Amino acid sequence: MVKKLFFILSKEDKNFLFFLLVFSVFVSFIETFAISLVMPFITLASDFSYFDRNKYLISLKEYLNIPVFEIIVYFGVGLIVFYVFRALLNAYYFHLLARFSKGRKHAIAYKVFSKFLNINYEKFTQKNQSEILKSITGEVYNLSTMISSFLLLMSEIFVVLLLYALMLLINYKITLFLSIFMVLNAFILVKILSPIIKKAGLRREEAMKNFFEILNTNLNNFKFIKLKTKEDGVLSLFKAQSEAFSKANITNESVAAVPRIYLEGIGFCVLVFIVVFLVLKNESDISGILSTISIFVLALYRLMPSANRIITSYHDLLYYHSSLNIIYQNLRQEEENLGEGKLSFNQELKICNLSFGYEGKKYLFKNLNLNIKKGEKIAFIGESGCGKSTLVDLIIGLLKPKEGQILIDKQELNASNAKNYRQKIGYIPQNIYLFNDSIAKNITFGDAVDEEKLNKVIKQANLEHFIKNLPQGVQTKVGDGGSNLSGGQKQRIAIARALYLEPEILVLDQATSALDTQSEAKIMDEIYKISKDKTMIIIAHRLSTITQCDKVYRLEHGKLKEEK
Template identity: 40%
Template sequence: MNIRDLLNIFTNLLDKKDKRKIIFLLSFSIFVSLVETLSLSIVMPFISVATNFDLIYKNDFYHKIYSFLGLQSPLQFISFLGAFLVVFFLFRSLIYFIFSYILSNFAQGKYHSFACYVFNNYLNFNYSNFVSENSSSVYKAIFSDASSLTQIITCFLQISTEILTGIFIYSALLFVDWKMTLALTFFLGIQAFGLMKFITKRVAKEGKKSGAVWQILSRTLSETVGNFKLIKLFSNEGHILKRFESASYSLAKSGVINKILQDLPRVILESLGFFTMVGMILFILWTYRDSSAVLPIISIYALAFYRLLPSLSRIFTYYNQMLYAFNSLGSYYLELPLKVESLGNQKINFGEKIEFKNIFFGHEKNKILLKNIDFIIEKNQKVAFIGESGAGKSTILDIIMGFYPVKNGEILIDNKILDKSNLIDWRMKIGYIPQQVYLLDGTVAENVVFGRTYNEELLIDSLVKANIYDFLLTKNGVDTIVGEGGIMLSGGQKQRIAIARALYSNPQILILDEATSALDTDIESKIMDEIYSISNQKTLIVVAHRLSTIARCEKIFKIEKGNIFEVDFSTKSTNVILKVQ
């Protein structure tokens, strides 16, 4: 990690308000450092006068204070200085507490905003980026990386405070005895530099290891939840647990090494400081031969060491924490803004037709999946797409819904081009029923409304049309709990909830992407009867592999080798399975 990396974080992730707060905190840290330095500086006069009362009369500064206060004896003057010292140190503690509170409040607030920043970007992903992104990376970015970023900013501010305090105290020591101060600086500086070079490389290495392990843990948890039945079926718990334990152990080991490396500078520097202090006292005593004459100097150096060595140790610790956090950080916080789709709110009317005109599309740069696709879907028409698995049926539905931008060609709605400027309004006209229905762990109402404006009349109407309302009345009505992923419902019931969800906004277009393929023939037939019935005044677009599902469609398009052509099935059988899987 270098200054450029730190500046990139501040530039890309902090707004103007945050930057003003950081400037305020840095200014406050200067004040805290001055108070810290003064708290040490005023100890020397107290010790000097306490060991030599004659200074009250010999030193003009002390004598003026003594006379101004109208004190009657040196003991009263010492008592006054002692009381002042106590009050000042209490004031110093209060200032430090206020600074710590403001700093913590800012840092934790940034954790909240960083986590929301990632989640907001994730919600606004371009769909093509969404399908290529590993969800475990997003979990890590929200929970782990947000904490790491907060730690980087906190440590930066703490380091700034400690450095400023060190500069002020060091300046005071130069004023007291610049030769001795420079000698001590040279001796301790060499030790500190060598220590820093040794530790930082290891900390960076452990940070990178931690980031990689966190991603493995997140992926393992995500895959376990998604494949729980298979794990139980294959009795595969041991393999999954072993994988989790291995990653967890690596994370714990990395944390232990990091903790040791963070504590090591404090132990070494305190030992070096103590040895240096003892050597300095012996040197002064051998040089001056009079302890009373140099006691104030010894005291100020002892107090300075008492404050500077922990400060230097904290600088090491904070820097290593920054390094560890930065190296465990993913690339999300620099990449996400490039992936967010920016959509407009322009209106687009659908009164006549949807037209694909010379459409070319491919998921990969050099691989074209759909070539020169042309077709028209009239309003309120029932249309089906068939083809082999991977031919591009679902892709066409995704393009209609605006999830994938086309490479060439145009999508026209009533002869108006569909693009980012009107995509939000277009999507609001669509009800979508996927093959895999994911239900929230909540009530039926929450699953149907799905974050939209709640309207009980529309809710009940959509459940009645989906032919599931009577069943719900035997339970808790719209407040019936469905369980995580709809585990408390049958496959057909989950599909009906999905239909109700699609109907809730009274869409002009219903899109079914193999929505009934996982159901048995009888249930599928009933559900499709209901869908055809409720879509009487709607445009229906279906992808399916059973003829019974698409038998009542007015147009059937087949996708084959990237091309599209209309087909006509004259067979009357309703159980024929088209060879398109």
């Protein structure tokens, strides 16, 4: 269970979080060397005796150094300097807890999250977005506040063993009491209150997952649920998650408080009964139980949190940790920074012996071959998602062939020159999930504000007649989905976001002119004269727009053939 922790925190985090245990264990010696001087400076204060008594204090007052006045000044100064050094120490030794916690929360989580970008786009498109986003958030904060209390458990147990090595080793009666009354409540809680708490924590984790994913599942299609506008759908579905997260979070945060209450109870009690046993021959009182009780109460309060944080973090480590590190070996070991190489598309692009499929799956290409010289302007009139959306995307640079090759000018561009060709093609998705911004955003997307490129693309895009019509112009709001940036605008901004990287493969990969019909007529002056410089791919199961193509591979069952 603790493997994934030293497996998530790299050498940097390991070194700096291994020294932290030393800091907390060594500062417990300060909070037991400056805090266990209280009795001495309260018992040497009334009366001014003590130094004319006992072997130690009489062999110390016989050091003839001084009297009993300047010693109080010196001791008060060393105690306020010990307290001031204790606090000056506590600043950085409690302000590093947030560096470890919120650090990994907002360093590790980010690194591993965007680490899921080196993966093949297949499985990245074979897992719900709700699942991905719900994970990269609450689990991060949870395991962050769960890691930063699982290293305060050993410091307090070592400080308790170190408090017992002097006040119970020593002391003998307090030895038996600190080895019987600190282990008699160690099984009363960590066996009876542990399991049910763990189960509550797991139930809470599943509840959180379910909730997040469901709500985001009602989020993407805000419309059909407002088509019926069902308070049925809305209230009931959201109340599944509402009441679930309610009962779960509440039960968790309540059972989490059971520990400290039971610790206090056992403390004041296990005082009472043992006090009631021996009441017929005393006939003396003394101390010895004072310091013992104060120390065992302090230690009990310092291991109660160890217990609770254990119960909850044992439910939080099973959640992420594995699911966040294991999907980082089939996804980062993938198309990561080319492969120290690149290629050129001066000749043709041949497919040759395709044969691919999904992660299930059933093959659909099965030894398929085709070629296209750099400028052929091909088209694929087939089955879409069983033809178009699949074969054309496979033809891009993503989705490794299950038996193919694909050669750009006779160079074998497999998982090698991948990055050096991925950044060498267009897109234009017509139904593009544009993000709220200002017209020019995205447009250039990840380029820049090249103006000379911005304006030129804007005029190239047959959209200058609605951009000049805009209110703020190139900085005109877009909203998001709709958001006038629909087909007409959306797809203009799409061919434009596709002209922003320029060369050299203009795949349709969407809709033959998004929506409008004069668009295969008005963006043909962009699709057939402007775009007369390169190699264009077409996802047209329609007509018209392929009035300037050359190869029309019809993918029947179960192979392609450029009918033309």
